[PDB]
Amino acid sequence: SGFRKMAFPSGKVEGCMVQVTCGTTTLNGLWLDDVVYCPRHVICTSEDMLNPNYEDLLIRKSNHNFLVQAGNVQLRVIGHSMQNCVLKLKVDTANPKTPKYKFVRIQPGQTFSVLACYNGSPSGVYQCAMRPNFTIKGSFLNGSCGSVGFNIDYDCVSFCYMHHMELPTGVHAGTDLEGNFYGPFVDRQTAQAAGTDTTITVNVLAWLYAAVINGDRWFLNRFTTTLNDFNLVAMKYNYEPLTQDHVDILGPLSAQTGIAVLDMCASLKELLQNGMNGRTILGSALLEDEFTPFDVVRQCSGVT
Amino acid sequence: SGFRKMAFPSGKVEGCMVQVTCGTTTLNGLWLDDVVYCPRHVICTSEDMLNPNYEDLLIRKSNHNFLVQAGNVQLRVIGHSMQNCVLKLKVDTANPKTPKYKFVRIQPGQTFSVLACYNGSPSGVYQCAMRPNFTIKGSFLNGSCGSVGFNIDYDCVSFCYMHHMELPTGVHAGTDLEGNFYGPFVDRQTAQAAGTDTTITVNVLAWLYAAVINGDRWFLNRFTTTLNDFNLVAMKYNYEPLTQDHVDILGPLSAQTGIAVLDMCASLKELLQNGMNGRTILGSALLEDEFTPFDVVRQCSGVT
Ligand SMILES: Cc1ccncc1NC(=O)Cc1cc(Cl)cc(N[C@H]2C[C@H]2C(F)(F)F)c1
Ligand SMILES: Cc1ccncc1NC(=O)Cc1cc(Cl)cc(N[C@H]2C[C@H]2C(F)(F)F)c1
Numbered sequence: 001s002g003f004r005k006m007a008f009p010s011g012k013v014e015g016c017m018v019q020v021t022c023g024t025t026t027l028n029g030l031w032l033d034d035v036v037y038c039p040r041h042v043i044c045t046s047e048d049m050l051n052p053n054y055e056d057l058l059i060r061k062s063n064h065n066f067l068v069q070a071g072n073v074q075l076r077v078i079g080h081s082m083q084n085c086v087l088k089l090k091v092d093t094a095n096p097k098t099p100k101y102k103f104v105r106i107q108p109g110q111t112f113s114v115l116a117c118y119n120g121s122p123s124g125v126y127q128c129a130m131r132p133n134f135t136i137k138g139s140f141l142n143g144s145c146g147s148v149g150f151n152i153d154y155d156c157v158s159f160c161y162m163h164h165m166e167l168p169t170g171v172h173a174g175t176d177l178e179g180n181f182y183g184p185f186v187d188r189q190t191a192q193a194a195g196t197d198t199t200i201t202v203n204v205l206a207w208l209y210a211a212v213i214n215g216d217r218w219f220l221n222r223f224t225t226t227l228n229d230f231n232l233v234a235m236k237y238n239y240e241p242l243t244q245d246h247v248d249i250l251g252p253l254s255a256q257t258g259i260a261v262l263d264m265c266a267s268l269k270e271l272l273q274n275g276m277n278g279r280t281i282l283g284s285a286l287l288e289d290e291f292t293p294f295d296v297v298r299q300c301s302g303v304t
Numbered sequence: 305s306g307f308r309k310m311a312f313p314s315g316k317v318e319g320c321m322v323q324v325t326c327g328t329t330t331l332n333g334l335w336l337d338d339v340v341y342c343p344r345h346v347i348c349t350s351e352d353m354l355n356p357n358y359e360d361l362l363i364r365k366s367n368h369n370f371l372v373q374a375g376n377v378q379l380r381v382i383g384h385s386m387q388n389c390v391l392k393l394k395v396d397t398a399n400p401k402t403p404k405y406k407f408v409r410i411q412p413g414q415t416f417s418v419l420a421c422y423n424g425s426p427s428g429v430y431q432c433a434m435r436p437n438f439t440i441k442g443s444f445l446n447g448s449c450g451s452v453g454f455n456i457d458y459d460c461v462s463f464c465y466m467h468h469m470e471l472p473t474g475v476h477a478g479t480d481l482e483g484n485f486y487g488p489f490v491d492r493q494t495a496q497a498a499g500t501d502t503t504i505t506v507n508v509l510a511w512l513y514a515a516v517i518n519g520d521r522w523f524l525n526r527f528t529t530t531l532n533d534f535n536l537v538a539m540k541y542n543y544e545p546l547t548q549d550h551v552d553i554l555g556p557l558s559a560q561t562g563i564a565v566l567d568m569c570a571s572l573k574e575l576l577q578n579g580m581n582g583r584t585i586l587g588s589a590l591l592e593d594e595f596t597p598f599d600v601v602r603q604c605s606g607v608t
Contacts, residue, residue, distance in 0.1 A: 001443075001444070001445075001470060001474050002441055002442050002443035002444060002470075002474070002476065003443055004430040004432070004441075004442065004443040005309055005430065006420065006427075006428035006429065006430045006443060007311060007428060007429050007430065008428060008429075009314040009315070009318050009419060009426040009427075009428065009429055010313040010314050010315055010429065011313070011314055011315030011316075011318040011319070011426075012315075014313050014315040015315070115313060116310065117608070118606045118608050119608065121608035122313040122315075122608060123310075123313075123602075123603075123606060123607060123608040124310035124311060124312060124313065124602075124603070125310065125311050125312075125313055125314065125429055126308040126309065126310045126311065128308070137306055137308075137587075138306050138308065139305075139306035139307055139308040139310060139603060140305070140306060141305075141604075141605075141606045142606075143606055144606070166305060166306075170305050170306070170519065172306065215474065280590070283441075284588070284589075284590075285588075285589035285590045286584070286588075286589045298427075298428075299427075299428070299443060300445075301445075302422045302427060302445045302446075302447055302448070303427060304421070304422050304423065304425035304426060304427040
């Protein structure tokens with residue numbers, strides 16, 4: 001028993017972390033096969049960030065201007081290209097520590113582990129979610145750009161995120177490993193709005209199932225509800241709509257505990273209306289929406 | 305910015321995880337040099353756990369009764385010994401992936417990362433604290449015994465914990481890597497009391513410094529306090545005594561923010577007395593005591 005915010009083991013991703021330097025700008029790179037991926041703003045200066053024309057800035061740079069380093073050893077950049085907001089540097093050596101990998105663009109509501117890195121070296125690992133408004137709440141400082149988000153499917157690493165920036169609003173924004181930003185953000189020094197964020201309803205329900213599994217049942221009531229009446233309440237408390245697909249996804253947790261999904265939606269309906277009266281659920285005095293139903297199944301069933 | 309419960313990168317510890325099997329009992333082992341460490345209850349059966357005489361049970365077992373496995377390959381146990389509550393199996397091969405390591409018995413109040421493992425394979429990594437009553441609040445299931453707790457000091461892994469058991473009370477209990485249990489627990493199927501737990505005051509203050517660093521300053525008041533008046537309040541709200549040594553430890557956070565330690569103790573004194581009125585600090589609606597002042601310094605300064 002016990003339920004923690006747990007990250008995937010970071011080992012397979014640590015062997016992919018290198019240091020990328022262009023001029024005086026030093027950030028992190030992801031080394032998979034003979035390609036080192038990093039955020040394109042590595043080619044910029046302080047003045048260039050205000051409104052960079054990356055096409056022009058990249059033309060001014062040749063392969064020899066990029067220093068890729070995998071520990072105490074240097075790699076040779078023998079090619080350079082721009083795929084959206086990422087730099088693809090073709091190195092002469094292919095990562096001997098490359099694991100089985102994939103590049104996936106994650107859906108909002110889904111979670112992933114971030115390996116926070118500074119100067120190509122890993123500092124720590126933590127789990128976060130892609131919020132419905134395509135922002136993430138990580139922990140990143142100057143030097144963390146190029147740090148990646150990932151999921152592990154047995155032995156295959158699915159890279160889903162690469163950190164690009166923290167906006168003046170404290171929002172963390174980045175791209176998938178094809179340089180496509182999540183949400184409406186751009187790699188430009190300008191004020192950018194994130195948009196109205198919402199609660200991931202299927203995730204709150206998944207964490208209420210984790211709490212039931214872990215002995216916290218105080219919130220279970222002799223009340224039931226319908227999907228429509230529940231979604232009327234969810235709308236009011238700015239929660240994402242609950243579909244029958246989300247009910248199906250919640251099925252393994254419904255089977256493990258014996259509590260139907262609508263009976264759980266009724267407990268959650270009361271939790272929103274009455275509050276929780278100081279009381280805690282899994283050691284939290286608020287509703288936690290950053291655990292997917294899949295993260296609950298994995299943690300509570302011992303998936304390795 | 306951002307402040308998360310962050311674990312050390314688990315890579316150096318994943319290369320030390322093997323599967324130990326004695327009879328029908330399968331758990332995790334830690335392979336360092338030519339020694340595989342695991343909890344001694346691996347030699348037990350369901351009937352043996354009620355009141356095991358481990359000296360007798362171990363005599364009944366010879367080296368050939370232990371199956372150590374490092375992935376898809378098997379190792380040869382050429383020696384076996386009992387150091388308190390751990391089994392030290394001398395294998396014929398020395399771990400090629402052994403990193404620079406140490407064995408430290410951690411103080412209550414300190415934190416560490418746990419690499420949760422099942423059948424010698426890592427499932428996830430999470431950070432937890434050794435509570436003042438020498439219990440931990442991890443996330444462990446059947447098959448997780450032998451999973452280890454650790455800290456990283458640049459490149460040196462300090463192993464501090466090995467999971468042994470979850471008591472009927474949900475408490476997680478285990479030993480240091482010398483088989484000495486933390487607290488008063490024994491590896492025997494009997495009801496065991498943990499003792500009165502207290503809040504780690506220096507840790508709550510460290511997390512209030514992390515919140516100030518991250519823009520949450522609402523709780524900072526035009527009030528100050530003395531160590532004695534603060535400890536009178538801390539006693540009331542079942543908080544660990546605050547020493548001048550804890551004030552010294554908090555110094556780097558005091559310097560970074562400009563807020564004296566006693567001014568922070570006064571904000572915390574009000575937080576205990578008034579509550580927090582639904583308001584959140586770093587996304588939590590309660591006081592968080594599982595971040596050491598050192599974890600705050602490391603996360604907020606980019607220590608790799
Ligand atoms: C500093 C940091 C912290 C956390 N995560 C990410 C980051 N880094 C960024 O955001 C990179 C970034 C992106 C944009 Cl579009 C502009 C700049 N501009 C120039 C001014 C200099 C700065 F690094 F000090 F910010 C920087
Ligand atoms: C199951 C588990 C879950 C989380 N962390 C740890 C564990 N495992 C334990 O506690 C091991 C343990 C220790 C003690 Cl002293 C007795 C037993 N007895 C026998 C009955 C069988 C059991 F595994 F099903 F519990 C087991």
